[PDB]
């Protein structure tokens with residue numbers, strides 16, 4: 001329990017809007033990130049310490065802790081530098097690159113610790129819920145720190161993008177690319193893949209191209225995972241084409257992916273988002289900027305996946321976990337069953 | 338609270354499966370159960386009625402409902418002394434259930450009238466109304482099962498065991514509920530979307546889709562969802578030369594009977610999706626009725642969840658909406674979802 005971790009964990013993370021992140025396009029981002037990134041690393045670090053001791057003692061969770069601590073300490077060092085020190089700004093970018101490289105394997109490492117703990121230890125129902133609660137928050141936390149760091153790196157280190165954000169993200173283009181990416185893996189494994197039947201409706205601007213401010217990589221990640229499952233279910237169940245509809249409303253950008261891969265019983269639909277990490281992480285990407293990712297399956301026929309994204313950058317605000325009394329109380333935590 | 342309410346509220350409701358409710362039609366056994374279970378269920382909800390805000394309980398409407406439930410609780414407790422072999426007690430018990438059923442006939446509109454006086458955002462009121470209406474659904478279910486099996490005059494549908502159709506023709510109920518909504522839609526708009534129905538029997542390919550279910554409950558759910566899909570479709574396409582059909586797919590899987598109702602009625606923002614399932618919430622004004630009362634979605638979801646099913650709405654704002662009903666395909670897993678007044682419920686308030 002280093003002192004810096006305890007200190008910065010007492011701060012609440014500061015969520016940014018997609019709009020703010022566009023404003024990155026160096027002195028201000030530097031002062032903000034040297035404060036905000038330790039805060040977010042410190043908050044999740046403290047939350048790691050309340051996990052079951054046998055999980056925290058796994059080499060994998062110990063690695064994650066050590067990486068996050070080292071990265072926190074690397075960033076806190078810049079609190080002694082001036083935002084006007086142009087070399088400190090340059091060094092700060094190199095440090096974000098180092099931190100990004102150090103965190104490159106966080107997701108599978110953490111996943112390895114969870115699987116090792118679940119496979120080897122008894123997990124009471126409360127603890128199992130807390131693990132899904134923790135992993136949603138841990139992976140959201142990583143998504144957020146990676147977002148903020150890459151935004152600073154990409155801007156101050158694609159030219160048509162502002163950092164990792166596309167101010168006029170061609171949603172349909174991303175859908176088509178993510179489908180093709182999944183289609184390639186599907187052919188490599190199944191030697192055959194369903195085709196894409198894509199419909200687009202722009203309710204906000206009829207007959208006009210659908211564009212929103214969004215992170216295309218995040219959108220690609222969500223769709224890629226949903227397409228992999230739709231294609232794996234379609235081929236194994238059977239090829240019927242995966243039907244996709246992209247809709248832009250006043251407040252929401254909606255993408256619905258539909259297959260006829262036989263579906264799954266409602267009893268098991270929730271297990272899809274238990275930690276098998278692609279779907280839960282995909283949903284985290286959707287919820288990161290106040291979106292959502294829902295699955296509704298028709299057992300015996302097929303499955304619909306619907307992505308909700310905010311159509312306004314001002315409302316696309318980071319959904320960040322905070323290690324405060326409420327979170328700690330959720331861990332401690334009417335109808336007949 | 339009378340002593341009987343305090344006493345019987347200490348017991349937890351005993352949920353029954355639809356298979357068990359069918360087995361009642363395979364009399365003293367149902368009498369022995371109901372004379373105890375119905376007071377317990379009335380007593381549980383009577384305790385929660387007191388937790389409501391003073392402005393709502395004191396409404397003549399809620400006080401009436403409370404007075405009805407109390408009297409029905411007392412009517413039923415009168416039978417605790419009788420022997421299940423007393424054939425006259427069994428006959429009188431049927432008469433009492435019919436009296437309680439008739440007394441409770443106007444509970445929902447009375448309770449709704451009470452909410453109108455008290456007046457969507459009240460989380461405790463949503464919590465209570467879910468539990469109150471689920472409680473009523475369950476007590477009406479149990480009483481009607483006994484009445485429709487053992488009464489001399491109330492026989493229900495000859496093909497049902499009580500109110501349960503062991504071979505519920507799901508598609509037929511869909512078509513009937515769609516026509517009922519179409520008739521109402523035509524009255525309000527002089528046009529109605531057509532039905533584009535698809536059925537997939539993954540459990541028994543190409544075979545008719547039947548499950549054990551309460552067709553009246555299924556009809557209510559579909560009727561309410563069709564009323565919403567038709568209204569949204571007509572109004573969203575009112576400047577179009579035609580109406581897109583409402584697409585329905587009925588799927589029978591190993592564990593689930595799934596009904597998806599898809600329209601192109603413009604959808605709704607994700608921001609207000611949760612608000613749609615709130616009582617009274619309606620984009621139409623409150624009537625004195627196709628829409629306006631704001632009970633279609635929440636009550637329909639109660640019916641779906643009453644037997645461990647569910648009802649979800651997934652909307653594409655600017656395009657249309659998917660309403661999906663999940664029902665258990667096996668009667669043994671179709672277990673009552675019942676509220677219980679305990680520390681958890683009290684803490685939730």
Ligand SMILES: Nc1ncnc2c1ncn2[C@@H]1O[C@H](COP(=O)(O)OP(=O)(O)O)[C@@H](O)[C@H]1O
Nearest residue numbers: 565569613619620628629630631632633634658
């Ligand atoms: N299929 C749908 N398409 C668009 N809006 C819907 C749909 N279903 C429900 N809604 C919205 O949810 C609200 C509540 O509906 P409901 O609970 O059935 O009661 P009511 O129909 O009286 O409003 C409606 O006012 C409507 O705006």
Ligand SMILES: CNc1cccc2c1NC(=O)C2(C)C
Nearest residue numbers: 229230233257261264303305
């Ligand atoms: C868009 N489709 C799907 C998206 C996610 C998960 C699934 C899908 N389809 C399936 O069968 C399973 C694997 C449940």
Ligand SMILES: [Mg+2]
Nearest residue numbers: 565628633634
């Ligand atoms: Mg309605």
